Structure formats: C-alpha cells, structure tokens
Design a protein around this motif. Sequence first.
Motif, PDB file in Angstrom:
ATOM      1  N   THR A 196      -8.882   1.123   4.217  1.00  0.00           N
ATOM      2  CA  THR A 196      -9.887   1.534   3.234  1.00  0.00           C
ATOM      3  C   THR A 196     -11.207   1.845   3.933  1.00  0.00           C
ATOM      4  O   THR A 196     -11.900   0.943   4.420  1.00  0.00           O
ATOM      5  N   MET A 209      -0.330  -4.107   4.853  1.00  0.00           N
ATOM      6  CA  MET A 209      -1.622  -3.988   5.510  1.00  0.00           C
ATOM      7  C   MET A 209      -2.003  -5.329   6.117  1.00  0.00           C
ATOM      8  O   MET A 209      -1.667  -6.379   5.567  1.00  0.00           O
ATOM      9  N   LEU A 262     -11.736  -3.118   0.714  1.00  0.00           N
ATOM     10  CA  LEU A 262     -10.494  -3.179  -0.052  1.00  0.00           C
ATOM     11  C   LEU A 262     -10.707  -3.932  -1.355  1.00  0.00           C
ATOM     12  O   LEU A 262     -10.384  -3.430  -2.443  1.00  0.00           O
ATOM     13  N   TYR A 304       0.850  -1.183   0.000  1.00  0.00           N
ATOM     14  CA  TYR A 304       0.000   0.000   0.000  1.00  0.00           C
ATOM     15  C   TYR A 304       0.884   1.231   0.000  1.00  0.00           C
ATOM     16  O   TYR A 304       1.807   1.330   0.818  1.00  0.00           O
ATOM     17  N   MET A 342      -2.062   0.548  -4.978  1.00  0.00           N
ATOM     18  CA  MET A 342      -1.447  -0.725  -4.630  1.00  0.00           C
ATOM     19  C   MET A 342      -0.346  -1.073  -5.630  1.00  0.00           C
ATOM     20  O   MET A 342      -0.423  -0.724  -6.813  1.00  0.00           O
ATOM     21  N   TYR A 356     -10.109  -1.952  -4.979  1.00  0.00           N
ATOM     22  CA  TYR A 356      -8.844  -2.123  -5.681  1.00  0.00           C
ATOM     23  C   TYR A 356      -8.708  -3.370  -6.557  1.00  0.00           C
ATOM     24  O   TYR A 356      -7.723  -3.452  -7.296  1.00  0.00           O
ATOM     25  N   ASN A 370      -6.772  -3.011   7.319  1.00  0.00           N
ATOM     26  CA  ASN A 370      -6.398  -2.140   6.219  1.00  0.00           C
ATOM     27  C   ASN A 370      -7.196  -0.836   6.337  1.00  0.00           C
ATOM     28  O   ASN A 370      -8.297  -0.823   6.897  1.00  0.00           O
ATOM     29  N   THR A 383      -3.870   7.190  -2.966  1.00  0.00           N
ATOM     30  CA  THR A 383      -3.281   5.878  -2.729  1.00  0.00           C
ATOM     31  C   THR A 383      -3.202   5.077  -4.019  1.00  0.00           C
ATOM     32  O   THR A 383      -3.840   5.396  -5.028  1.00  0.00           O
TER      33      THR A 383
END
Lengths: 388, 388
Positions: free
Chosen positions: B291, B265, B346, B184, B227, B350, B289, B225
């Motif tokens: 999110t 995370m 999450l 992350y 990934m 993502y 995490n 953000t």
Amino acid sequence: QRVIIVGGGPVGLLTALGLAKAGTNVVVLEAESQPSDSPRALVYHFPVLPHLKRLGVLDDCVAAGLMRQNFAWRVHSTSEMIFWDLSCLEGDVELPYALHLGQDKLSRILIEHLKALPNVEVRYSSPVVDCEVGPRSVRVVLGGESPGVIVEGDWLIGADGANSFVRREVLNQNFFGITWPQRYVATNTRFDFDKLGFGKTTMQVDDVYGSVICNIDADSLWRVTFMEDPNLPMEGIRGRIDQVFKELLPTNDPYEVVAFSPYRMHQRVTDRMRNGRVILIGDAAHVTNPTGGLGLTGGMFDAFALTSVLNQVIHDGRSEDILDVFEADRRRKFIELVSPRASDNLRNLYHQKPGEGKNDWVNNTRSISKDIDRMRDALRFPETMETF
Amino acid sequence: QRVIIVGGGPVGLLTALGLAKAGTNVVVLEAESQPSDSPRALVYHFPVLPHLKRLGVLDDCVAAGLMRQNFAWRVHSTSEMIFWDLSCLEGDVELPYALHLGQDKLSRILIEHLKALPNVEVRYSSPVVDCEVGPRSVRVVLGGESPGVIVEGDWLIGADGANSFVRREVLNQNFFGITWPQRYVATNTRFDFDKLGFGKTTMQVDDVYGSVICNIDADSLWRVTFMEDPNLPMEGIRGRIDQVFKELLPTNDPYEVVAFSPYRMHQRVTDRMRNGRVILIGDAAHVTNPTGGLGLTGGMFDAFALTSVLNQVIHDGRSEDILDVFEADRRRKFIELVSPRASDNLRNLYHQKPGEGKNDWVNNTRSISKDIDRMRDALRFPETMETF
C-alpha cells in the motif's frame, strides 16, 4: 568459569539464581544502589509461576504479594464491566493464577536467596566504567562504592535495561524499531477500587481515558495509567494527573497519588542476542510498550531459557552453538509474537474512538467471556512466549 | 572483481546497470524465463526519478509509461474525492512527478541498455541450485537452460525476492516479522476511470471495499485491489471478483478483468543485508505490504545505495567496512520508516470502519488538501527513504 551479570533487576537476579543453583560461579553488578521501585509492570502471568516455584521463590512471592484469577475489561463510555477468569485454565496449566508483586519486592526476595549461595557475589552501587571483551574472556572495572575493582569472567550477560551499556558500548549494536507518539503516564495511586467491584487487573477501554488499573498491595494501592501528548510541559504533569483523574476514576471518592513517572514507549529489538561471550536479555535485548505486561514476561523467559542453555554449556559440555539457537528463538518470539500482541493491546485499550470498530470489539469481548473455549484461548497467550 | 546478481527483476537489473556503467564485470542470473508481469507496484515516486535519469533510462520509461502529478483519496461511503497534487513540489525537487510503468516493462528497458555494455551478461531461465561461499570469493552452479554451468565471482548479491534462495539457503538467515490476516487480491482491470475524474492513482477508503486504483497504460487498464478472507477457496476467486466489483467500482459501467493474482502480505526483515561477500537487497532483504508502493521504492533505493558504495569498493579501493554502514542504514530505513508507514497506510486504507476515527481521518486529509505546506510535507515522505 565465572559469569558476570550486569543488571540488578529481576531479569539479572533470576538468571543469577538459576545459574547459581546449578553450581555456576556468578557475579551480579548493578550501577544503581538498590532495585528500582519505579512504576513498572508487576504481574507474573501463569506460565512464569512454575519457574518461580522451581527456583524456590514462589512461596515468598505469594506471602509478599497477592494471587488472583479474575480480570475485568471496563468500557469507559458505558461503565460496563466484562470479567474474564483464569479458573477456566484449572485443568490445563499447573498454576492457573496471576501474581501481583512489585518488581522491587521480587528483587529483594531474590537477593535474600542469593545470599545463601556462596558461589554468587552481588554488588550494588557498582557501575561498570570500562569493559574489554575477548573471544574467550571478559573484563570489567567498577566505579561507585567499588572503586577500581577488577572483575574477570568467561561470560558477560547484559541484563541492564533499555539503555543497556552492554548493548550500546560493549557490542555497539543497533536498537531499531519505533517510538510511540504519546507520553505514557504511570502512577501508583491510593484509591479503593476493591469496594467498586474492580478486577485485580482492570483494563479501562477509551480513547481519552484508557487505563491499566492494577492492584499493587493490600493498602488499596493501585497502578493507574493514562496517555498524554508528549508536548504538554513536564512541569504541569502533577496538575494534569488531577484533571485527568476527575474523569478517569469511577467515582469522586478521595485518592492519594503516591508516585508517578512519565515514559516514552518503544517497540525495538537488537540485531543479535548473542555475540561471542556476550549475551543480552530483557530490555537490553528488546523493548515493548507495557500494555499486558509482556516486556516483563518476555524478560523472565529470556532468563529461564538462557539459564537452561548456559548451564548445559558450562556443566554438560554442550556445544556453544546452542546459544545461537537460543538467541534466534528469543528474537523470534519477541518480533513475531510479543511485539505485535503488545502493539494491538495498546491500540485496543487506548485508541478506539466511538464507532463500529469499538462496538464490535466490545461485543466480541463480551462473547468471549461467555464461551469458555474462547476464553481459554484468549487467556493462554503468555504460554506461547516461552522458548522450548 | 566479478559481481554475480541473483535475480532478474528491476532491483537486480538496476543494480546491474549502475555497477556496469562504472566498468564492473557483472553477471545477472534469473531463475525464470523472462521478467514477471504479475500485478505488482508500478509507480516510481519523485525521488527515484533523478536516479533513472542519471542512469539514462528515464526517457525510455516516460515514452513507455506515463507521468502525472495528481493524486486522489476517495471516500467510498460518501463518494467524496480529495485531490493532492505533486506540483506543490515544483520548486524543491528537480522532478516533481510520479511515473506509472509496469515493472516488466521497466525490466525490459533495462535489459536493452545492459546489452550495450559488453562487461555484463544477463542469463535468464538459469536458477541457482548450488552455491559455495568463501571468505573472498563465491561460486554458483546453474540449472535451467544452462545446466551444469559454473559461475565464479568476488561478490554475490541476492536480489531474488521474498522467498530468496540466497537469504534462506546460502546465508541461512531468518525472515522474522508478521503476516497480515487478509488475502490481498490485485487485479488488472480494464475500466474507464478517466472519464469519472479519478486521480491516476486513487486510493479508495473503506472497511470492506478499500482499494488502490492506479492507471497502468493508455487502454484504460487500471490496477484495482481488494482484501478478502484467505480461508475462501482459491478456486472461486474469479466469481468473487465479480461480486466485489458490484459495489467496489464507482459505476455500473462495464469492465474487463484482464489479470489478477492473490497474495499474502508481510512485514518482515532479515538479520543483516551484508555478510562477507554476500549482500541482500529488495524483497530478499525485507518485505512490506504494497500500500503506497513503498516496497518497490525501498528496493530501488537498496540498489542505488549499493551501487554507489560497492563501486567505491571495487574501483576506488574503499574499505569493505562501508558495506557494514550500508547494510545497517538500509535496515534502519526499512524498520524505522518504511514498515511503520506502510502498515499505517494499510490500516488507514482498508480497515477504518464507520466512526469518529474515520471522520477525523477524512477531515484531516481534506485539511491537508487546502494547505500547500502541509500537502508539501505529506507528499515528501519517499525522499526520507533514501540512504546518504
């Protein structure tokens, strides 16, 4: 030092046998009057088999069940079968097979073996009506066909299932986690999957008709599963089985629904698997959805690890602190390895709608099937669940 | 009855202020030199805001940050913006707003209010290096800019983050769970999202360029953000930020990367949040995490729940067993509500690749947007995280 095991299923009986073969005095108490034959996991993965052999029951299991090495993924949208095969483990593990056998039949074999041990007493139809637990002793009183009988011991093992009396009532421990949204429908269905080329375990991938299709016995009896909305009324379920099966099954060939059982599934674990003279194993300690049969496998590894450690406490004078090491490692395996793996299993098998993800999953599954090293690594997972 | 808090972040400082306002003697000890300004969650959802007002710091937060009601989901593939709006809660919650404010700025406001209370001491650059815990008292010895100093108290609260000294070394508790496979990367990026209509929090949905885009201050500084595979070398991350932002940002307008930090995370929780005179809260108790900012929110509800119960212990002589209730409920919230929700957050944000599932997701999100009662119910989730 008597050990009292509450629970007459495989986990409790395997613990009984291992303890008993070491000279331990054991009393097994089951509320129901016989081992359950309800539709549940029925595959004993390769790393379990050496322990069954060591306990002396593998040969009887093999005679009563079946051994296989093949495994198939079936993509419902395309009818593609993708085979993986445990023979790629032939020089890596002692017994590179999978054993298919109903838990009720394994339980009966275990019971016949316990009869030979005079140091073990087995009592079905004997629920626990009251239990008091001290720092050094345990005491239960029975009902059912054992009215008022008093059983005293040094250790109480809770091996009595997801709704464990011992976890809830004796220990008053939590069972935190999640319950999956869908109702799980597990059937035993007579249908000739063998003539159609199916793996003895075939995992059907779809978003509506995902299924575990797993051979139970030689009369073409197979486990067949599916998911449904838990709001659909319970009285219509047998009729819905027929409606689902018209598309789930690979042909319009005849079938007989021999048995069926709806379940809610959970990912849950208790706060602690040891608390003084009380220990929890199997579903009393932790529950996973059954995709991949990892609840059964984990419960058996609960049984084997506890047998080793508790035999040392009782016979070798080992410090009781090893039990704390045991209980933490068994929670570590469940929380860190089993529960995420089973959850991914459920999602990959039952919940992939059409799209890029599903196509990538299939392409990857096909690639593993042509690469022995990736196949070995894929197939090896259950061995990581054992505590050393 | 002196309470020692290990940790100088918002969770520790919020607990300090609540205890102090009731007359508790409190000592706060932070290892580091000042409150962290590393990029982390910065949104305080509507059910946190009445507690900040009750403690009397909400006014300084508003002046220092911003309040808003709007919220946007953005579909990267289609550039569709779908807005949800907190003013649909106007009638049912007393403060239907979201507060944006850096945690470091929050911590500094809390430091100012703690100065006014002589019964609190706040020692920064004072890492704990040794600790003794007894049945009815605790003692610590400090390093840092206070070396050899001995601090004694009746209670020890571990609020010192994911790698907590109190959890690992004082209690020797576990931290079982999972670590997500992706790195992350949370940037603070100066970019004019305001002129493009973005929501003050915008959540960009994609399988490659998923992103939380959340306004930090009034100089067009925003959190952005993404990934990435953690096997990429740590050293080239700044160049990779530029490559990612080429397609992540909504236009080719100029930007300035002001700060960034990489994270792994987790979804993890300790065995118990109370053991004798030691209590764990915040990231020392459980990690999710980020999110949806549920870790910050859950940690703050840790503090508010602990303050209320522990004040009852110290000043009203309530039985210490209220702490056993407290700790189990806080674990229940995390395990059964927060960690499953954040985990779904999450995956939804993502990892949804093109397909039927994502189209279903977008259509549902858009339907909620036009159904005031469904939007009410979607937005309301954080109030369920509070313990009563």
